[PDB]
Amino acid sequence: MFRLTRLSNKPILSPIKEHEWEKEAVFNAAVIYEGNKFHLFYRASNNKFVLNTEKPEEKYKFVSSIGYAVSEDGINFERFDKPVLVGEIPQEAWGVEDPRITKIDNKYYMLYTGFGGRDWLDFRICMVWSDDLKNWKGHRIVLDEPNKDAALLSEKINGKYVLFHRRMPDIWIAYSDDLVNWYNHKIIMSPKSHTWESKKIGIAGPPIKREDGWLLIYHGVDNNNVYRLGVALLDLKDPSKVIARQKEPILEPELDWEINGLVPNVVFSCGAVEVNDMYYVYYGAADTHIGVAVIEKEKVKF
Amino acid sequence: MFRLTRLSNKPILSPIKEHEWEKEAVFNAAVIYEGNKFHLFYRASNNKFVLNTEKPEEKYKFVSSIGYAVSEDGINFERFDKPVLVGEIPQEAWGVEDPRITKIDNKYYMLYTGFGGRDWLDFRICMVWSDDLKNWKGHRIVLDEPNKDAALLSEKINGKYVLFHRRMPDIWIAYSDDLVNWYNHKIIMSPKSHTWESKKIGIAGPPIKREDGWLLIYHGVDNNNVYRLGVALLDLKDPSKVIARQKEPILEPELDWEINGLVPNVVFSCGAVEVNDMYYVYYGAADTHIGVAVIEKEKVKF
Amino acid sequence: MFRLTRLSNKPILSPIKEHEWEKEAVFNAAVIYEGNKFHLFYRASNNKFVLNTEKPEEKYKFVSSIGYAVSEDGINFERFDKPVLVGEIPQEAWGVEDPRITKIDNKYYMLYTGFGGRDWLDFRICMVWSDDLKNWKGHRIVLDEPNKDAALLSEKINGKYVLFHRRMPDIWIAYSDDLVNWYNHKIIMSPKSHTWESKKIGIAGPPIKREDGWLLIYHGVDNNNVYRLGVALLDLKDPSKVIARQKEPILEPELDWEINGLVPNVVFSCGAVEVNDMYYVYYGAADTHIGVAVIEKEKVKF
Amino acid sequence: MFRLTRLSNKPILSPIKEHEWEKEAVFNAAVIYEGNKFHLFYRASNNKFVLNTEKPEEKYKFVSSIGYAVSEDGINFERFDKPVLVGEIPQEAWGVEDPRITKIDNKYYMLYTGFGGRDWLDFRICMVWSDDLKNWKGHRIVLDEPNKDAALLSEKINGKYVLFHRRMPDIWIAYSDDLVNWYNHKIIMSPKSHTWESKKIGIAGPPIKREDGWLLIYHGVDNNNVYRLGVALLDLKDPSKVIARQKEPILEPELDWEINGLVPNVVFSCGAVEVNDMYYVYYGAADTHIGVAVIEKEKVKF
Ligand SMILES: OC[C@H]1O[C@H](O)[C@@H](O)[C@@H](O)[C@@H]1O
Ligand SMILES: OC[C@H]1O[C@H](O)[C@@H](O)[C@@H](O)[C@@H]1O
Ligand SMILES: OC[C@H]1O[C@H](O)[C@@H](O)[C@@H](O)[C@@H]1O
Ligand SMILES: OC[C@H]1O[C@H](O)[C@@H](O)[C@@H](O)[C@@H]1O
Ligand SMILES: [Zn+2]
Ligand SMILES: [Zn+2]
Ligand SMILES: [Zn+2]
Ligand SMILES: [Zn+2]
Ligand SMILES: [Zn+2]
Ligand SMILES: [Zn+2]
Ligand SMILES: [Zn+2]
Ligand SMILES: [Zn+2]
Ligand SMILES: [Zn+2]
Ligand SMILES: [Zn+2]
Ligand SMILES: [Zn+2]
Ligand SMILES: [Zn+2]
Ligand SMILES: [Zn+2]
Ligand SMILES: [Zn+2]
Ligand SMILES: [Zn+2]
Ligand SMILES: [Zn+2]
Ligand SMILES: [Zn+2]
């Protein structure tokens, strides 16, 4: 088995109480590595996360925003006073969550969860895109259904866009001619009962192309809602086929700010990039902080 | 197949009309047996409990206080003219409810529900502690979320403090290194459909240590909001594991002042202590009075 | 140790398919003995009773009406083309159920359940009255709450009217000065676990005055929703006190048309009169037909 | 604990494109072992299943038929050109579903869900019978209510026909003297929260008589609508009494044609037979194909 190794025993991004939109939490962050820079797009919450109510209650409302941070070494990030993305329509009344960014041809696609807070199924995969990672346009509901953990493949298979999504509790794949209509939905990977990944699974960041397949980092949730990261390999030509899947996780809550926090016992990645023959996996921790762990790509064997 | 036996067919503590803070109800009492004396910390209400309005309304406002009473024989108590704990404004503006007190090493921890009355979900588990059952301090919100039916285990498990709580409608467990931050949340016990405990369950008093495990008295609520008491046995080394659970209740409303009162059909315990090879279980009755019922320790078997 | 004896092995009243309002069911009938005639006011349903849906569904809507029938011998009844009372639309959209008629000071009070059908709790005790059993008037919601199984006592107690009602699952008593406002609500009788009357109880017909107390026939419901009739005796001067209660039912489904029907396994009385020192107990059978059973006044011994 | 073992990693029956009535799905099959042959009566659909519309839409109409197939070995089946049961119009306009066939005293009773498609509650338990498995007659609505998952016991109990049915979400039992009118309704088994069988349960095929009880294979539905097979044992003399119930499933969606199909994540049995000390469990897979799994009888242990 292989596993990620943290670069810091402390977060690389933490909430800023002076900033309302990231007052309580910064986590679950998309990343792409473009101009020799790490472009990090992080979920941020103005509030703690009451989840145990029958419906989302306005008195316990939290608002998710996406922030931007940039770094050259992967560790130290420059941050900004304001978020780059917020919810603007009622379906995103409780904000925009867990972004995954994929570059296809020469455009960047950010897939996030729009949460409206009207009930606990009131969340949708949404998409905006940009030429430049700065000006997001063309907001759309990707699937009109309670769904999340969505990512696009960085290229087309047989001329089709590929979407990973997550009809509970499985990782699903779907295909599109036009990034509008999705078809040939199917389950590509399922939880394993009586294990750390028993309750549900979902893609982590967008799959990373390798020579032996597409690297599929994913999160698994156990019966007590611990989020841990696992890893699987998709067939290179047919990313609907899992060709390998590591039995044990590659990241689990270990440090205090991963075990303890707003949502205890969570590590969760929305983004990972290949940089200098290493995979940089940025992860939310306890839905409160962002850490980063790496693995030399040479060590990724199944 | 065992039951509690009421020590009296009359309440042992009743409201005092002359005391505003306990004019209408005394009930749901934490219990500690120290210095050959029963220490009762009882919920007290200045008012009946109108609960069927959309929001808590000032004209139906009730305020819970924690009063204190002490007894050598368990039946006759010395009472006090003012309560020993009242709610801070505004988070506990409608008062402090259902204390459970746990002695860990040489400190006493009182967990109770702070109710702010700003919404019907405006309640949370709070904690105060004392080394003497007299000077309570160090107030903190245990879980910042709508939650109640909370109690500490009387000792640490693998070096962690153990919290029992109640995200609706199950009995949960959680662990802490510092009595501030809780993690490893786990459901340990659930309602049982089509039984007296179908709607919801919650811990009673803190679990009593035995050689065969932890005695976990609890309350079950049926479809008609009748509150009864039941018993389970937790594993001694992992109290998250229920190793036995009696099907039948050990106490149910039977006497007129358990069936009739401010909230009909309630027996509810927030404390039970081992004295002279007997379990003394103090219980609110109809959210109006306090009774006491016992079981010979030898009769506790599953 | 005592039981009712069916007068007839035949329903004394059955639905009439050609009459929409009583096409499927005649049952749960109020009865008054006046002018040496049995005056039966029976619940009639246009439809079968689909009760297993999560909510009442318009497609399975049933409409209860109240018909009149009159007999001189209490066995053979004359009937009429049209109901005497109908649910006013929409507040009683699914009709008017289970009438209980009490005579007080030459006025007849009919208490019935108005059912709006908007959810399964959309029911309440309504009351009309008359001084001739023909011209019903004065409709009012007796208690603004989900409630049923209501009857008035046939005289005042210490100057106050007496209402029996049924906040689930118990028989309740309440008092009024004006037949509009009720106070001093109190449970007087409860189901008994692990018996034929375990799930709930409710009053049957209005209590019958005796020299030794108030005869309180009631229905009890077991864990499988079988309806049987029990009997208790209320203190003559304080009918809040049950002074006797028979362990075993006095009537239970035995005949095919009591065991089988629109609601299987039901006998249910809303009406019982004393005629020549016999109690004539009229009963719905399987919510489909009406039977009559009797017991000599002298054999009512507890 | 024990598990079924699939006889093939491929379906034993699959849709047949040139037969419209079974063009898209063959699944949920009744089975009878007579004349040393497996007689399979399988549900068949002319269409994919759109189930998430607000009402059953003509534009997505599917029609279920019952096809017949026969096999010597239980694996290789001869099939036929026409279905053997189709729905009456209009109450069964969307066809006849999920047959369970019980032999009682030289008569064969097929219980199925008749679905009329007029709304999503427009289904009911229907029954036909034959003495030859070929000439089905005596159509009747078994319970005139939204209900399904029905099967008859292969014997009477104290002279009574025994019906298993499923008022949501439990397995119910009921009894009849005439195969027309049903009474003594009783819940016998219920879903279990926070398990694979939390949402609802329903009988699989008719229970199989054993020396130690009736084998009740059933299906359990989790919170994500995954269908799995479980197994319980009913008391031999009193099959309303569950005397054992395995915690783990005996069969779960595992193969791709069980996980992906017209309805994902479904294994479902309507029939199982004992041949030569093995139970053959026929199961629909993803509401699309039919597989068959077995368990040696010796290994069936509670
Ligand atoms: O998407 C709504 C909600 O779903 C889950 O509860 C978590 O992923 C939350 O962080 C999220 O906000
Ligand atoms: O906790 C707030 C409120 O919760 C419930 O409604 C009851 O337990 C009340 O007694 C309590 O005051
Ligand atoms: O009152 C609503 C409804 O309640 C019960 O289900 C039965 O008594 C029905 O006959 C009645 O219509
Ligand atoms: O019963 C009607 C309809 O409802 C269910 O959800 C499914 O089993 C369908 O296959 C069936 O046709
Ligand atoms: Zn700033
Ligand atoms: Zn959106
Ligand atoms: Zn996820
Ligand atoms: Zn005083
Ligand atoms: Zn507090
Ligand atoms: Zn639960
Ligand atoms: Zn509780
Ligand atoms: Zn019981
Ligand atoms: Zn006529
Ligand atoms: Zn009315
Ligand atoms: Zn009733
Ligand atoms: Zn009998
Ligand atoms: Zn053909
Ligand atoms: Zn039919
Ligand atoms: Zn149920
Ligand atoms: Zn089912
Ligand atoms: Zn399992």
Task: Using DSSP, state whether C298 is helix, strand or coil.
Answer: helix
Closest-CA residue of chain D to B198: D193
Is C280:C270 a contact under the CB 8 Å cutoff?
A: no
Distance CA D22, CA A16 (A): 62
Q: At C291, list the tokens.
A: 């039977």
Are the Cβ atoms of A170 and D196 closer than 8 angstroms?
no
- Provide the phi-psi class of C144: left if phi over 0, else alpha when psi is between -120 and 50, else beta: beta
Nearest Cα to Cα of residue A31 among A203, A274, A288: A274
* 8 Å CB contact between A225 and A219: no
C200 in reach of chain B (CB within 8 A) = yes
Indicate if ligand 4 lies below 6 Å from the C-beta of D45: no
Please name which of B263, B302, B280, B277 lies closest in space to residue B27, comparing C-alpha atoms. B263
**Rounded to the nearest 5°, which phi and psi values hold at B298?**
-70, -20
Is A52 in contact with B182 (Cβ distance < 8 A)? no
Residue D144 neighbours by CB under 8 Å, 6+ apart: C48, C50, D124
Alpha carbon distance A210, A217 (integer Å): 13
Q: Are A282 and A43 in contact (CB under 8 A)?
A: no
What order of strands is seen across the sheet that includes strand D77-79? D25-34, D37-45, D64-71, D77-79
Query: Within 10 Å of residue B94's Cβ, how many Cβ atoms?
Result: 22
> How big, in percent rounded to 5, are the helix, strand and coil portions of chain B?
5, 50, 50
Neighbours of chain B (3+ CB pairs under 8 A): A, C, D
Candidates B114, B144, B54; CA nearest to A53 is B144
Separation in Å, CA of A176 to nearest CA in chain B: 40
Distance of alpha carbon D229 from alpha carbon D249, whole angstroms: 5
- Are B224 and C186 a contacting pair at CB < 8 A? no
Chain-centre distance for alpha carbon C234: 18
CA distance D104 to D107: 5
Here the tokens at position D61 are 């109409």
Number of Cβ pairs < 8 A linking chain A and chain D: 19
* Domain C5-299 class in CATH: mainly beta
**Could you tell me which residues come within 8 angstroms of residue C194 by beta carbon, excluding any fewer than 6 positions away?**
none
Ligand 4 atom having least distance to the Cα of D51: 6
Q: Which residues of B touch D223 (CB under 8 A)?
A: none
Record the resolution, in angstroms: 2.2
CB atoms within 10 A of CB C83: 21
User: Quick check: A108 and A102 in contact, CB under 8 A?
Assistant: yes
Nearest by Cα to A285 from A260, A294, A276, A295: A260
Q: Is the CB of B45 under 6 A from ligand 2?
A: no
Q: Which two tokens stand for residue B249?
A: 């209740």
CB < 8 Å to B146, chain A: 50, 52-53, 60
Ligand showing the shortest atom-to-Cα distance for residue D168: 19
- Could you give the angle at the alpha carbon of C246 between the alpha carbons of C242 and C251, nearest 5°? 120
Contact predicate A73/B132, CB 8 Å: no
- CA D158 – CA D175 distance, rounded (Å): 10
CA D42-D48-D53 angle, 5° bins: 120
Copy the structure tokens of residue B54: 């959309």
Pick the residue whose CA is nearest to atom 2 on ligand 2: B115
* Atom of ligand 2 at shortest range from CA of B263: 10
∠ Cα C43 C49 C53 (to 5°): 140
Q: Does D82 touch chain C (CB under 8 A)?
A: no
Cα within 13 Å of Cα(A109), Cβ side: 24
Do B150 and B164 contact (CB within 8 A), yes or no?
yes
- Structural contact between residues A19 and A46, judged by C-beta atoms closer than 8 angstroms: no
Which residues are bridge partners to C161 per DSSP? C176
How many other C-beta atoms lie within 10 A of the C-beta of residue C21? Answer: 21
Q: Which helix (H) or strand (E) segment is C258 a member of?
A: helix C256-259
Ligand 14 geometric centre to CA of A148 (Å):
48
Residue B259 touches partner C, C-beta closer than 8 Å: yes
Q: To test the ligand 4 pocket, which listed residue (D97, D125, D165, D262) has its Cβ within 8 A of the most ligand atoms?
A: D97
Residue C13 burial (10 A CB sphere; 0-12, 13-18, 19+)? buried
Residues D28 and D99: their CA atoms lie apart, in Å, by 7
Q: Quickly count: other Cβ atoms within 10 Å of residue B184's Cβ.
A: 19
- In what helix (H) or strand (E) does residue B259 lie, and over which residues does it extend? helix B256-259
CA distance C248 to C222: 12
Paired strand residues for D30: D41
Cα Rg, chain C, nearest whole Å: 17
From the CB of residue D108, how many other CB atoms can be counted at a distance below 10 Å? 21
- Residue C263 Cα: closest atom of ligand 3: 10
Distance A28 CA to ligand 1 centre (A): 11
Which residues of A are less than 8 Å from B54 in CB distance? none
Mutate to test the pocket of ligand 1, among A48, A49, A269 (most ligand atoms within 8 A of CB): A49
The residues, any chain, with a CB within 8 Å of residue D15's CB and separated by 6 or more, are D22, D23, D24, D25, D26, D44, D288, D289
C168/B contact by beta carbon, under 8 A = yes
Percent helix, strand and coil across chain D, each to the nearest 5: 5, 50, 50
Q: Do B194 and D193 touch (CB under 8 A)?
A: no
Is residue D124 within a helix (H) or strand (E), and if so which, with residue range?
strand D123-130
User: Residues in chain D, how many?
Assistant: 302
CA nearest neighbour of C51 among C148, C112, C120: C120
Phi, psi of C83 (to 5 degrees): -65, 155
DSSP E strands: which ranges in B51-181?
A: 64-71, 78-79, 95-104, 107-115, 123-130, 137-143, 151-152, 161-165, 171-176
Q: What is the CA radius of gyration of chain B?
A: 17
CB B60 less than 6 A from any atom of ligand 2: no
Cα(B8)–Cα(B11) distance, integer angstroms: 7
How far, in Å, CA of B193 to CA of B201, rounded?
11
Q: Obtained via which technique?
A: X-ray
In angstroms and rounded to an integer, the radius of gyration of the C-alpha atoms of chain A is 17
The verdict on a CB contact (< 8 Å) between C53 and D181 is no
D295 close to D250: Cβ distance less than 8 angstroms? yes
- The closest alpha carbon to D146, from D189, D174, D116, D188, belongs to D116
The C-alpha atoms of residue B171 and residue B221 are separated, in whole angstroms, by: 13
Contact criterion met (CB below 8 Å) for D38 and D244 = no
CA distance D230 to D225: 15
Residue D284 Cα to ligand 20 middle (Å): 12
Distance CA C57, CA C60 (A): 5
Q: Does D190 touch chain B (CB under 8 A)?
A: yes
User: Inter-chain contact C170–B259, Cβ cutoff 8 Å?
Assistant: yes
Helices vs. strands in chain D: H and E counts, helices first? 1, 21
Nearest to B9 by CA among B288, B300, B285: B285
- CA B60 to each of CA B114, B123, C241: distance values in angstroms, whole numbers, following the listed order: 18, 17, 30
Check: CB of residue D49 under 8 Å from CB of residue D37.
no
Contact at CB, A259 and B183, closer than 8 angstroms: yes
Cα-based distances in Å from D77 to C60, D39, D69, D73, D288: 42, 9, 6, 8, 17
Atom of ligand 1 nearest to the CA of A28: 10
Sign of the four-CA dihedral D270, D273, D278, D280: negative
Judging contacts by C-beta atoms under 8 Å, the chain B residues touching residue A61 are none
What is d(CA C263, CA C272) in angstroms, rounded to the nearest whole number? 22
CA distance C136 to C85: 8
Partner-chain contact C167 B260, CB within 8 Å = no
The shortest CB-CB distance from D145 to any of C52, C225, C260 is to C52
Task: Give residue C270's identity as a one-letter amino acid code.
Answer: C
Give the list of residues 6+ apart from residue A140 with CB closer than 8 angstroms, or none.
A126, A127, A180
Count CA atoms within 13 Å of residue B299 on its CB side: 11
Q: Which of B276, B268, B270, B267 is nearest to B295 (CA)?
A: B276
- D135 — contact with chain A (CB < 8 Å)? no
Say whether residue C224 is in contact with chain D using an 8 A CB cutoff: yes
Q: Searching chain C, which residue's CA lies closest to the CA of residue B264?
A: C187
Neighbours of A5 (CB within 10 A): 14
Nearest to B193 by CA among A35, D216, D102, D193: D193
Measured between CB atoms, does A76 come within 8 Å of chain B? no
Query: DSSP letter at D250?
Result: S
Q: What is the C-alpha to C-alpha distance for residues D291 and D285, in angstroms, rounded to an integer?
A: 7
DSSP assignment letter at B276:
T
State how far the alpha carbon of A258 is from the alpha carbons of A265, A267, A269, A290, D94, in Å. 6, 6, 12, 9, 53
d(CA A52, CA A223): 16
For chain C, domain boundaries: 5-299
- My answer on whether omega of the bond before B206 falls inside 30° of 0, hence cis, is no
Q: Burial level of A225, CB count in 10 A (0-12/13-18/19+)? A: middle
**Quick one: tokens of D58?**
């003509």
D57 class by beta-carbon count within 10 Å (0-12 exposed, 13-18 middle, 19+ buried): exposed
Other C-beta atoms within 10 Å of C122: how many?
17
Show contacts of A222-225: CB within 8 Å, 24+ apart.
Answer: A222/A195, A222/A196, A222/A197, A222/A198, A223/A198, A223/A199, A223/D194, A224/A265, A224/B184, A224/B185, A224/B186, A224/B187, A225/A199, A225/A265, A225/B185
Cβ separation A190–D224 shorter than 8 A: no
Residues 6+ apart with CB under 8 A from B225: B199, B265
Peptide bond into A90 cis (omega under 30): no
Cross-chain CB nearest to A53 (options B146, B184, B185): B146
* CA dist D163 → C106, C225, D234 (Å): 52, 17, 13
**B281 near B229, Cβ under 8 Å?**
yes
CA distances from D148 to C77, D97, D168 (A): 41, 9, 9
Question: What SS3 class is residue B285?
Answer: strand
CB-count burial class (<10 Å; 0-12, 13-18, 19+) for D112: buried
User: What residues have CB less than 8 Å from B271, skipping those under 6 apart?
Assistant: B29, B30, B31, B32, B40, B41, B100, B101, B204, B205, B206, B281, B282
| Alpha helices for chain D (secondary structure H) | 256-259
CA distance C132 to C18: 29
The answer to whether the beta carbons of residues A167 and A150 sit under 8 Å apart is: no
| Residues measured by CB to lie within 5 Å of ligand 15, the ion | C 149, 202
CA distance B233 to chain C (A): 24
Residue B280: phi and psi, rounded to 5, are -95, 120
CA-to-CA distance for C148 and C166, rounded, in angstroms? 6
Per-residue DSSP letter, C22: G
Beta carbons of A187 and D265 less than 8 Å apart:
yes
Distance of CA C260 from the midpoint of ligand 20 (Å): 26
Q: Considering only CA atoms, which of A234, A221, A219 is closest in space to residue A153? A: A234
Look at residue C226 and give its three-state secondary structure. coil
Tokens of C208: 């019958």
Alpha carbons D180 and C212: distance in angstroms, whole number:
47
Ligand 4 near D115 CB (within 6 A):
yes
Greatest CA span in chain B, whole angstroms?
A: 50
User: From the CA atom positions of chain D, what is the Rg in Å?
Assistant: 17
- Ligand 2 pocket, residue B122 CB under 6 Å: no
The per-residue DSSP string of chain A comes to: ----EES-SS-SB---TTSGGGSSEEEEEEEEE-SSSEEEEEEEESS-----SSS--GGG---EEEEEEEESSSS--B--SS-SB---SGGGTTBEEEEEEEEETTEEEEEEEEE--SSTT-EEEEEEEESSSSS-EEEEESSSSS----EE-SS-BTTBEEEEE-STTSEEEEEESSSS--EEEEEEE---TTSTT-SEEEE-S--EE-SSSEEEEEEEE-TT--EEEEEEEE-SS-TTSEEEE-SS-SB---SHHHHSSSSSSBEEEEEEEEETTEEEEEEEETTTEEEEEEEEGGG---
A136 lines ligand 1 (CB under 6 A): no
CB atoms within 10 A of CB C226: 23
Ligand 3 pocket, CB under 6 A:
C 51, 97, 113, 115, 123, 148
Helix or strand run (H / E) with residue C256 = helix C256-259
Q: Considering every ligand atom, which ligand is closest to the CA of D23?
A: 17
Please work out whether the CB of residue A45 comes within 6 Å of at least one atom of ligand 1.
no
- Residue written as token pair 């439809």: C47
The count of other CB atoms within 10 Å of the CB of residue B144 is 15
